[PDB]
C-alpha cells in the first residue's frame, strides 16, 4: 500500500533445537545456570546428547529451562524508465507509413 | 563428596564449590552437604540441597539464622553457579552374567563419564571357591 | 523427594522399615520366549525299505 515507505518486512520463527536459537534462559539438570537455552543444537553426537538430556527426579523444581528466538527479513523496490522523441517532418515525408 | 556453598547478597548468586576451594568475591559461607546423598542417592540434586541450606539463613544478613517468615525461600531470583567437579556416573555397566565355553576369549568393557581427569582403572578377581576375597589382577 | 528410592539394587523405601521390604517389585508377563525346531534336509531324500 501507499504511505508506508519502500520496504516490506516479515518474521521467521526458529525451532527450539537449532544452533540459531541463542539465549540465556538455560538451566541444566543439576539446577545450575548454563550458557545455552536449547537442550542441544543441530548436533548428532551421542556423547553430547547423553550429557545434555533432560532428566527428572521425583521432585523436579527449576531443573530444565528453554528459550526461543525469531528472525526478520526485508526487501525494497526501484524505478526505471526511458524515452525517445521525433519531429513531424520525419513522419510526414518518410518513405513508408506505419513507422510509429 | 562434601560440597561447600557460598552466597552473595547483592547479586543473589549462590556458588557451589569443593570443600578445599574458597572465594574472595565477598560472599559468605552458608553450609555444606553431600552431593550424592547417603540414603537417597538418585532422589535429590544440587538444587534441593542448596534450597535446604538456604532455608536456615536470614534475609537481612546471610551470616545469621532466622525463623520461617525471615528466611531466603524465593528460589526464582537466586541463581546457582557450579564450580565443583561434576559427579562421577557410570554410562556403561558390565553385563551381570556372562556364559561361555572352555577355550574362548571374553571381553569386558566399561565407560565412565564425569569426574576430574585423568581416570585410573583397576580390575579385581574373586575365585569361586569358598572363603575367597578379591585380589588384583597382575597388570 | 524419592522416599520410594529403588527397592531393587539394595535401596530401601522410606515407609518400609530396615527389616521388611516391598512384597512385589516387578511385573511378570508370563509369556515365554521359545525357539523353533531346526529344519531337516537329508531326511526327505531317504527311501524306506521294510524289515
CB of B42 within 8 Å of a chain C CB? The answer is yes
Q: In whole angstroms, what is the distance from residue B44 CA to residue B52 CA?
A: 11
Name residues whose C-beta falls within 8 Å of residue A43's C-beta, 6 or more positions apart in sequence: A49
The CA distance from C2 to the nearest CA of chain A, in Å, is 5
Identify the CA nearest to B95 among candidates B81, B106, B83, B84. Answer: B106
Residue of C nearest to B47 (CA): C1
CB-CB contact of B35 with B46 (8 Å): yes
- For residue B122, CA distances in Å to B110, B114, B139 come to 12, 18, 9
Residues of A in contact with C3 (CB under 8 A): 58
Residue of A nearest to B42 (CA): A57
Name residues whose C-beta falls within 8 Å of residue A44's C-beta, 6 or more positions apart in sequence: none
Give bridge partners of residue A100 from the DSSP assignment: none
Name residues whose C-beta falls within 8 Å of residue B61's C-beta, 6 or more positions apart in sequence: B9
Give bridge partners of residue B34 from the DSSP assignment: B2
Q: How many CA atoms lie within 13 A of A35 on its CB side?
A: 2
Q: In whole angstroms, what is the distance from residue A47 CA to residue A56 CA?
A: 19
Interface residue ranges in chain A relative to chain C, Cβ cutoff 8 Å: 57-59
B80 and A32 within 8 Å at the Cβ level: the answer is yes
CB of A50 within 8 Å of a chain B CB? The answer is yes
| Structure method | cryo-EM
Q: In whole angstroms, what is the distance from residue B68 CA to residue B35 CA?
A: 25
Residue of A nearest to C3 (CA): A58
- Counting as contact any 3 or more CB pairs under 8 A, the partners of A are B, C
Q: Is A49 left (phi over 0), alpha (psi -120 to 50) or beta?
A: alpha
Specify the 3-state DSSP secondary structure of B85. Answer: coil
- What the block records as the C-alpha cell of B34 is 553431600
CB-CB contact of C15 with C3 (8 Å): yes
CB of B66 within 8 Å of a chain C CB? The answer is no
Residues of A in contact with C1 (CB under 8 A): 57-59
- Residue in A29, A33, A51 closest to B80 by CB: A33
Amino acid at each position: 500500500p501507499k504511505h508506508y515507505g519502500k520496504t516490506i518486512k516479515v518474521y521467521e520463527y526458529v525451532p527450539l533445537l537449532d544452533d540459531r536459537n541463542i539465549n540465556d534462559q538455560g538451566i541444566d539438570a543439576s539446577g545450575a545456570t548454563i550458557v545455552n537455552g536449547n537442550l542441544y543444537g543441530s548436533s548428532k553426537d551421542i556423547g553430547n546428547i547423553t550429557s545434555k538430556l533432560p532428566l527428572l527426579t521425583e521432585n523436579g523444581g527449576r531443573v530444565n529451562r528453554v528459550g526461543f528466538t525469531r528472525i526478520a527479513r526485508e526487501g525494497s523496490i526501484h524505478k526505471f524508465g526511458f524515452f525517445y522523441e521525433f519531429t513531424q517532418e520525419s513522419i510526414d515525408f518518410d518513405s513508408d507509413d506505419g513507422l510509429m | 563428596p562434601v560440597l561447600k556453598v557460598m552466597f552473595h547478597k547483592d547479586t543473589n548468586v549462590a556458588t557451589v564449590l569443593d570443600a578445599s576451594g574458597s572465594l574472595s568475591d565477598g560472599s559468605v559461607e552458608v553450609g555444606t552437604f553431600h552431593h550424592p546423598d547417603e540414603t537417597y542417592p538418585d532422589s535429590v540434586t544440587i538444587y534441593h540441597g542448596v534450597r535446604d541450606l538456604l532455608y536456615k539463613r536470614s534475609a537481612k544478613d546471610p551470616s545469621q539464622t532466622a525463623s520461617y517468615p525471615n528466611n531466603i525461600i524465593n528460589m526464582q531470583v537466586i541463581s546457582i553457579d557450579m564450580k565443583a567437579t561434576p559427579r562421577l556416573i557410570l554410562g556403561t555397566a558390565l553385563p551381570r552374567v556372562i556364559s561361555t565355553i572352555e577355550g574362548k576369549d571374553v571381553t569386558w568393557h566399561v565407560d565412565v563419564a564425569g569426574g576430574k581427569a585423568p581416570l585410573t582403572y583397576k580390575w579385581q578377581f574373586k575365585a569361586n571357591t569358598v572363603g575367597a576375597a578379591f585380589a588384583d589382577i597382575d597388570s | 523427594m524419592l522416599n520410594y528410592n529403588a527397592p531393587t539394587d539394595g535401596q530401601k523405601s522410606s515407609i518400609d522399615g530396615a527389616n521388611s521390604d516391598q512384597m512385589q517389585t516387578f511385573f511378570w508377563l508370563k509369556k515365554a520366549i521359545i525357539t523353533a525346531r531346526k529344519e531337516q534336509y537329508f531326511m526327505p531324500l531317504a527311501s524306506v525299505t521294510n524289515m
